[PDB]
Design a protein around this ligand. Sequence first.
Ligand SMILES: Nc1ncnc2c1ncn2[C@@H]1O[C@H](COP(=O)(O)OP(=O)(O)NP(=O)(O)O)[C@@H](O)[C@H]1O
Ligand SMILES: Nc1ncnc2c1ncn2[C@@H]1O[C@H](COP(=O)(O)OP(=O)(O)NP(=O)(O)O)[C@@H](O)[C@H]1O
Ligand SMILES: Nc1ccn([C@@H]2O[C@H](COP(=O)(O)OP(=O)(O)O)[C@@H](O)[C@H]2O)c(=O)n1
Ligand SMILES: Nc1ccn([C@@H]2O[C@H](COP(=O)(O)OP(=O)(O)O)[C@@H](O)[C@H]2O)c(=O)n1
Ligand SMILES: [Mg+2]
Ligand SMILES: [Mg+2]
Lengths: 651, 651
Amino acid sequence: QTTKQFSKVVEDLYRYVNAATGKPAPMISDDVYNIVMENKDKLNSAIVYDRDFQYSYFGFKTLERSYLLRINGQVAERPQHLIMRVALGIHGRDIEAALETYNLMSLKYFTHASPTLFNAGTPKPQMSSCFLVAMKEDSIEGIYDTLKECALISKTAGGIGLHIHNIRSTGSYIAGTNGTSNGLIPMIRVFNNTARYVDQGGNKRPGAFALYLEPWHADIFDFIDIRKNHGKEEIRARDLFPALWIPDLFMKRVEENGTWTLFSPTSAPGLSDCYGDEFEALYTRYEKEGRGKTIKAQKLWYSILEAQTETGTPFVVYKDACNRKSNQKNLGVIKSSNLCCEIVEYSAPDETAVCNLASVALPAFIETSEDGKTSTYNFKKLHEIAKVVTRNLNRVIDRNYYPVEEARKSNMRHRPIALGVQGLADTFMLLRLPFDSEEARLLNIQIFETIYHASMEASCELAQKDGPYETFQGSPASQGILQFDMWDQKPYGMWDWDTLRKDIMKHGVRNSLTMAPMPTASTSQILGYNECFEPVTSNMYSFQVVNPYLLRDLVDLGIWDEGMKQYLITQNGSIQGLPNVPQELKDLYKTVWEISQKTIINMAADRSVYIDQSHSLNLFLRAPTMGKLTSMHFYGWKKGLKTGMYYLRTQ
Amino acid sequence: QTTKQFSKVVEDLYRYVNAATGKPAPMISDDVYNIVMENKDKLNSAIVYDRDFQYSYFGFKTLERSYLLRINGQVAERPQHLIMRVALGIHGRDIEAALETYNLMSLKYFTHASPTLFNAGTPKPQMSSCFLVAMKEDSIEGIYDTLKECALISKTAGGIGLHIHNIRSTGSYIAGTNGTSNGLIPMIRVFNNTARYVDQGGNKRPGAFALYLEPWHADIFDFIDIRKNHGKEEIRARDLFPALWIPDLFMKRVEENGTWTLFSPTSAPGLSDCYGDEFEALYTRYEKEGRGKTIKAQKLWYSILEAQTETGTPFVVYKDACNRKSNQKNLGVIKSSNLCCEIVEYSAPDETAVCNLASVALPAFIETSEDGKTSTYNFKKLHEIAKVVTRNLNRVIDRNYYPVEEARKSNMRHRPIALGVQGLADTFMLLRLPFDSEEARLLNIQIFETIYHASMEASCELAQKDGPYETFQGSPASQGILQFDMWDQKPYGMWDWDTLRKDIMKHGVRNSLTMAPMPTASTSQILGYNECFEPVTSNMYSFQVVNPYLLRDLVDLGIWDEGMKQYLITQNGSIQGLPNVPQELKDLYKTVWEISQKTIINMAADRSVYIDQSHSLNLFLRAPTMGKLTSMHFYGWKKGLKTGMYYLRTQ
Ligand SMILES: Nc1ncnc2c1ncn2[C@@H]1O[C@H](COP(=O)(O)OP(=O)(O)NP(=O)(O)O)[C@@H](O)[C@H]1O
Ligand SMILES: Nc1ncnc2c1ncn2[C@@H]1O[C@H](COP(=O)(O)OP(=O)(O)NP(=O)(O)O)[C@@H](O)[C@H]1O
Ligand SMILES: Nc1ccn([C@@H]2O[C@H](COP(=O)(O)OP(=O)(O)O)[C@@H](O)[C@H]2O)c(=O)n1
Ligand SMILES: Nc1ccn([C@@H]2O[C@H](COP(=O)(O)OP(=O)(O)O)[C@@H](O)[C@H]2O)c(=O)n1
Ligand SMILES: [Mg+2]
Ligand SMILES: [Mg+2]
C-alpha cells in the first residue's frame, strides 16, 4: 500500500501541503531533500525491502502506529524509508557513513532512540531524548522562567528531569510581605499543570517531568507522596515523578537508626552545591546550629518505603556515587538525574543538559560460527558496531535542533553521549544461559566492557580529527582516570586499556560521557527483543504471544499441548513448578520475579564500572515487605550504585 | 492599646526586625522615615486622634482586620497614623500638600484605593489597583511570558484584566507537528492555576484575573461558561472572570436575528486590532470568504444569557463605544477592560496599562448651610476636593513602584488617573431624594459634571507646570474634543467648559484619562457609606445593622417597635407594602431590586458623558427571565454605554 521508490517517497513528503489550510508543510529538511536528489540512484538501489520482513507483527505496528511518517493520515514511509531517512539526517553528505548506518540498522544491529527516529531528516530535527533542567532561582521570576523553559522543551520529543532543591519550603519567610511561602507542593502543582497543557509534538503520551529533591528538604514528606491516589488532590501532582537525590549521610542515619534534620534551603544554604565529606561537614554544622527541624531518620525512611510500595516511586539515585564517579565533576556539582534515571550530567540555570541515545541489539552478535552447532559471541563485531553508534550520536549533536538556548550551550561544551542495549535477556536465552549463571555474569561484564572500550576509542579518534570537547582539560579522563578506575577496580581486560588510556591522555576524547543504558521502552518493541538489560517479566507477555525461545524448546521436547498453553495463562508466564519440564528449561526461563534481586543488583553493580553515567535499574518484588525492600535499597547503595532504584514494580 | 506619638510609631515600624529569622524588615521607606524625622513636631501635632471616632464599629474593624500595619501580629498603627503615612507616601517633601491630604482624609472627604492604603510610605510602594495586560503572542513563548508577567504582578496588590483574542482556537493548525491546538480552555486552565499559586501580598483574596474575549472567537461557547458549577472540571476555570469585549455587529446580528460567524484569529487575522465600520467591513469579508464557522447569532446569545443568569458573568463591555469615545484612541485600538470593568485603557505586548484610584465621599459636601433647616450640596467644596484628589493620584504615578517593566512604560507615557465616588445612595437619602426622582437624576449629572470638570482643570494646571503627557498630541483632548463632545452632547453647564477647553488646547493636560468610578468594595466599608453609585441592596444589610437614615426616621415618626425590626428581617430590607410607613419613606428607601433597571441604565447613561473611562455597572434582577435580561443588555448598548454590565446579581 505504498510508493516503492525512496526518492519518490522523499518527493511527496517534501512537497506536502496541508489541504485544510493551503499551507506548504514539508516534512523533509532542505538539506536532506537535496542530498536525496543529488544521489538518488546510489540511495534508491542501496535499499533492500526484504528487510521489512525482519519486523514481528507487533513490532511493525509500533512503527506504523506512530513512527513512519504519514501523508494526510495514510502511512507514506516503508520501514526501509524511515531508516534511510534517519541515516541521512545523521550523516548529511557522508553517503558512505549514511550507507553503513542504513545497513546495520536495517539488519537490526542497533537503532536510535525514538526522537531520532521521529525527527531525523525532518526540518525540526529535535533528535535528543532527555533534558536535565536546573531551577533558575528561588524567586517568582526564576520559577516562571523555568516553567517557560519546560514548556518550550515539552513542545518537542524528550523528557525532563528537573531539580528543585533550592526552592524555599512551606512557611519560609519572604522579604516584602507578611506573607509566608507555601513551598514545593503548590509550585509542583504549577509544573504539573504545564505538563498537561503542552503536548509532546501533538500527542498521546501525557505529562512527564521527573522531579529531583534531596531528602533533607523541609517539604520532603509531601514531595515523596506526589503520586498517591487518595490523600487530598491539591496536595498531589499525578503526572510527575518524584525522584530522591540521596546523599550517603541519609542512608548512614537510617542504618545507625539516628536523627535526620530538615532545612529550608534558605535557612541552610549550599547543601546541594556540595557532596561527600564536605556536605557532611556543612550538614552536621547547620544541624548543630538549630537551623532546621530534626526528626527520626527512620520516620522519613519508613514513609519513602510506603510511597514506593504503593506507587513504585520515588526513584532512588545516590548523589555522592554520581558525583564522586563522574567525568563531568570538573564542571561543578551534579544536581539530578533525568526522567529515566540513566543520565547523570551537570546542569545549571544557564546550562540544561541533553542526551542523545542509541541502543545496540545484543542478540545480533551471536553466531554458531565455530563449525558444528555451538554458539559464541562476536565481541569483535560488537566492538565494531559500538564504534559506529558512537560516531552517529556524536554527529547528531551537531545536526540537532535545540529547543532552548541552555540546551545548545550545554551540549556544544561537553558533548555527552548515551549508548545502551537491548535484548540481553534474549542473548542469555539464545546462548543457553540462566540470567543468574556464572556465565551470564561473565557475559554481562564482557559485553559492557566491550561497548565502553569501543565508545571511548571511537571518541578518541574523533577528538583527534576535531579536538577534545571544550571542558576535557581537568577532567578525570584527562588524568588517565576512566570509569572503572573511579570504582577502584582493574578492568576485566578483554581489551587493551593501557593503550587507550595512553591515547586519551595524549589526544582527548570527543565526549564527556558515552554510556547510559536506558529503558528502551519502545525501541525494544520495534526490533522485537526484551527491554534493555532486564530479565523477562513473563514468558507469555501479552494479544498473548509466547516466548519464542521457550516455545521452540517446548516443541523440540514435544511436550507442548493445550495443557502447556493454559498453564502459562494460569501461572502468567512462570514455568517453574510445572510437572513435565526439564530443570534446564526452568533455570533458563525464570521470570524476573523469580530471580534474586541480589543477583540483579550484582550484575548491575558489575556492569556499572563501565558506565560513564548510570542505568535504569527497575526492581521487582513479588511479595513486597518493609524490610525486604529495605535490604534491597541498602545492598545497592553499598555496592556504590548510582541509580539504586528506578521503579519499584510489584504485585 | 497603641503608642500615641506618630514619629514614635514610625520609629518602631521602620526599626522592625523579624525575630524568627534575625532579618531587619523595615516597613517604612527610607524616604518617608527621613521626612517624618526631619519634620517630627509639625507632623506629630497636626494629627487629631478624635477623628479615630469617625469610623463605625464595622468600618474600623476593616481597618484593623487588614489595613493598619502590624508589628508581630499586634496592631501598631492608629487610623490617624495610616492616613498620615499615606499623605507622606504620596507627597514626599511637600509637607503642605501632605498636611492638606491628611485633613481631608481624616475628616472623611475622600480616600485612596486599598493598595495605596496598604503600601503608601512603605519600601515596596505598589499603590496601583488595576493592570490591563496584553497576551504577548500566539506562541508557547508568548503564552508563558504573559503567564510570567501575571504572576509577577499578582505578587503585589491589584487585579488583572487580560485579553486573549489572538490565541488560536481548538483544532487550529500548528506548523512543525501533526499536532492540533487545544485552544483557550486548556490555556485558561494554566492561568487559573497561576492565579491560585501566587498570593496577592500574602493573602486571603484568592485568584482574580478577568479574561477579555471578543464573541467571534471560535472558543467562545466554553469561554463564557468558565464559572459554571457542574459541566466537567478541566473545562472550567473557577477563579477567573470571563468578560465579553462585544462589537456592535454582534448585537446587530442578535437584534436582526441573523447569522454569527466564529473564526480562529489565525484564519481571520486583525479582528481585534480594528473597530466600528472598518471591523464590520473586515468581518463581513472574512465571513463571505468561508474562513469561519457560521451559526445563528441567537444561539450564542441565548448561551451568554444562561451563563449570566447562573454565575452573574460574563461581564459585558462594548468594544466600539469604548474605542470611539476614548481620549487614548490616538494610541491604537483598545483591547480590554480591567478586572472590575471600569478602566478603559490601551495595552500591547510591551505596554501593560495601570490605574491609580481614589474615591470622593459624596455625603461630606452636604450642608444645611442656608439658615433654617434645608440641606444643599456644596458643589464648590466638591470641585475643590476633586482637584486635590486629582493632584494626589498624579503624584502616586511617580512615587509608585511598578511590578513589571511594561507597566512603568505604559504609565509614564499616558499617565491615566481614576476618580470615583461612594455614598451616592447616602447622598440621595440625606437630601431626601428617591434614587428615581427627577432630582436625583439632576444631582447625578451635576455631581459628575463637577468631578470631571475639576479633574480636568487640575490636570491642566499640572501640564502647565510639568508638560502635557508624552502622547497628548493628536488626542481628541488636544483637538478640543472632551468626553461629552464624543457623546454629541452639550455639558449641563454648571462649570465654564469653554474656558477649560480653551486652556487644554493651549497647554495640554497631565493625564490621558481621569475618571473611572469603581466598585469601592472595601473603602466604602471603611468610611461607612454605600458602595460607589448603586442604590442600597437592603435596609438591614447584615451582624445585622439597620439603615441609619431609615432608623432615624422610624423613631421620628415613632412607629419603630419590635413589629418593625422583625418585618425587616422577614422582608430582608424592603419597606414597601408595609402597613404603617409613609409613602415618602417608601419611595426614599427603595432597595435596588425595587428600582427600575431602566432608571439605573439612564443615570449611568447620563453620568457616562463625564467619564473618560467607564464604570462598574452592576445589574440587579429580582425575578430574572431570558427576555427581561435581553432588553436590559440592549437598552444599555443603545444608550452607548461602555460597561453595559459588570455582574448580573440575582435571586
Ligand atoms: N505572592 C507570592 N505567592 C506565593 N509565593 C511567593 C509569593 N512571593 C514570593 N513567593 C515565594 O517566595 C520565594 C521568593 O520569591 P521572590 O519573588 O524572590 O521573593 P522576593 O519578593 O524577591 N523576596 P525575597 O526573595 O524573600 O528576598 C519563592 O520561592 C516564591 O515562590
Ligand atoms: N506542544 C504543544 N502543545 C499544546 N499547544 C501547542 C503546542 N505547540 C504549539 N501550541 C499552540 O500553538 C500556538 C502556536 O504556538 P507556537 O509555539 O508559536 O507554534 P510554532 O511551533 O511556532 N508554529 P506556528 O506558530 O504554528 O508557526 C499557540 O497557541 C500554542 O498554544
Ligand atoms: N515514555 C517515554 C520514554 C522515554 N522518554 C525519554 O527518553 C529516554 C529513555 O527512553 P526509552 O529508553 O524509553 O527509549 P525510546 O522510547 O527512545 O526507545 C528518557 O531519558 C526520557 O527522557 C520519554 O520522554 N517518555
Ligand atoms: N477584591 C478586589 C477588589 C478590587 N480589586 C482591584 O481594584 C480595582 C477596584 O477596587 P475597588 O473598587 O473594590 O476599591 P478598593 O477595594 O481599592 O476599595 C479593580 O479594578 C481591581 O483591579 C482587586 O484586585 N480585588
Ligand atoms: Mg527574591
Ligand atoms: Mg509561533
